[PDB]
Write a protein that binds this DNA or RNA. Structure first.
Length: 101
RNA sequence: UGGAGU
């Protein structure tokens, strides 16, 4: 079982974004950790789709404004080693293509 | 480096 192609509603929701995954974090943790604030519409990683050498972040996505600004006002900048969280609103949309030619 | 999904 996998995401495949989860259809969001980004055209009518807050579409929050989160990043700054530590050298020991994963999207499954980023989900259980940000799900407690309310809900998450997606939690996914570009992982260069075939090289995964980046993984320095995991683009999580929210829909509730009140739960998106709260998770941001309650976890971003809560760092203690040089990088723990970075969360703010998205202003950029899904890729049409970045992995083929 | 703010997303490369069948």
């Amino acid at each position: 079982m996998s995401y495949g192609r989860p259809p969001p509603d980004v055209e009518g929701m807050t579409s929050l974004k989160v990043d700054n995954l530590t050298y020991r974090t994963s999207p499954d943790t980023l989900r259980r950790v940000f799900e407690k604030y309310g809900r998450v519409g997606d939690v996914y990683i570009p992982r260069d789709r075939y090289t995964k050498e980046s993984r320095g972040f995991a683009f999580v996505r929210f829909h509730d404004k009140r739960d998106a600004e709260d998770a941001m006002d309650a976890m971003d900048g809560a760092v203690l080693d040089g990088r723990e969280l970075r969360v703010q609103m998205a202003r950029y949309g899904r890729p049409p293509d970045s992995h083929h030619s």
